[PDB]
Amino acid sequence: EVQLVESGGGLVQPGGSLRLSCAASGFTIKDMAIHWVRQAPGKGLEWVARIWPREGFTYYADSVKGRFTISADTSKNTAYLQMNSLRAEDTAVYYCARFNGYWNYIMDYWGQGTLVTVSSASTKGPSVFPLAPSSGTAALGCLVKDYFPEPVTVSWNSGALTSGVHTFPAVLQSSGLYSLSSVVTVPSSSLGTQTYICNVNHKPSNTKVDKKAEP
């Protein structure tokens, strides 16, 4: 269980500050380099910066040089990315990863990533609306409409139903709010007897919604 765990991510105003932190479990960072790498929504990986915690040597991509500060507390086994003057361009999943040339640790362990959303848009909970069939197998669902930011989770009958569940990627609408659908395929014979409840959780707005998809 060698582990890099990130925290500090979330939704900030443009021109704001945020400190990311990257905790190491199962190794000491004192003889490792910690790199930060970021992945913009539907894009590739971009290298941000790296620190050698022992020596204090730091190195920044030109897009972040000046605005961001990388540091490390060897006594907390933890690395930091201080981000200032945030712009929409810095919106990404930020990963931290270890590097040691001698032991072939060439970004062999990565953190789980923390999503950083730079926006002036307020948080907003979804409205949940049932997708019911009009009229061998049938389909019902729910439309999770007009939320911000990402992400939402959908479950069916509190996780009890998993067979043939499809939850689609969120599309950004013109409005600037996200929309998605969850659908399940079930037998047509079960429609009048079983109840199908979708469970919507939007942790950013602290919003839990339960919705019956009903003929």
Next chain:
Amino acid sequence: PVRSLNCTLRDSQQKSLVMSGPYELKALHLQGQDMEQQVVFSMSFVQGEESNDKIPVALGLKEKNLYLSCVLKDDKPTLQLESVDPKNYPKKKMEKRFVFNKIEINNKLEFESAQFPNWYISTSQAENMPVFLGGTKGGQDITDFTMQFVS
């Protein structure tokens, strides 16, 4: 009356040499005020076999009392930082262990040990690893260097 000038070495992938504790050099990328921590070499030109593109040379470190030397470890030639009396050195007539051939194969420098021919001052691909003596030129290591003059 030996000809010695001051400089900094950089490898073909743009790594600088710094001190990693009292008797080791490492090669790593430096940006900004990190770059003032790079080691300055007093390269003293010395007497030895001068073939076509090869100039014999020695490599000390500005007032640390240290010269780069090639010595055997497990019957293997090895790069080592060697302290020495500073009133004696630098000299023209110097022990072959301190002596490197400054080869200029491309528009770049190699440094072949004089005592161990076919062994070069080398860096790894991964940064912040030791400067070592490497036995191939045609292997997976970096033997090709740039020099930048300093006064």
Next chain:
Amino acid sequence: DIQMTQSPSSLSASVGDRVTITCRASQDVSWGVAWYQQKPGKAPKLLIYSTASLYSGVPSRFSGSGSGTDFTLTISSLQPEDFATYYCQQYSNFPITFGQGTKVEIKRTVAAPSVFIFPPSDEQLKSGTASVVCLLNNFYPREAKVQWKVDNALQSGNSQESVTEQDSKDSTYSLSSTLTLSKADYEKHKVYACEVTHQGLSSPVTKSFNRG
């Protein structure tokens, strides 16, 4: 800022046969090249480091070759858990740079889409909007055309698509298409229809409904 041009951007192949991903360098990066596999929504993990050394624990079907400027990843025979994206990286020159990656999508037998249409709920129509949803369930390959017809008139730029990843068990795509109208615009038309085209159908499949 050395570019790492990776190819192809998108590839498709069947379990058990070999695949070659290629990666080209804008200038000479010696042997400082690595390969990373990213499953969607997850952290990349290391496969190959130093052009051709295989990281501890990686299946020995995974192979790396390269020559200073041109580098290549090979898998000799695909297996279940290799639905991923693969990225090349150069770590010999700073700043470290990546390629745009290559998505590796596992090919199956062509599967026809099963189509459904959902009218807007009564609840949404109180708020002053209507979303008509069309669903293409469980299909291969990915390419599919969804057309919206409102009183037999083709629609433009009032609909958005979203596609799943290849399903756990059966390797099939699903697709949502979401036609958005005002309370007003929705009430002044009777018939709403969804036209689907795909390599698994004889002809275009239409689903439809009347407001009542």
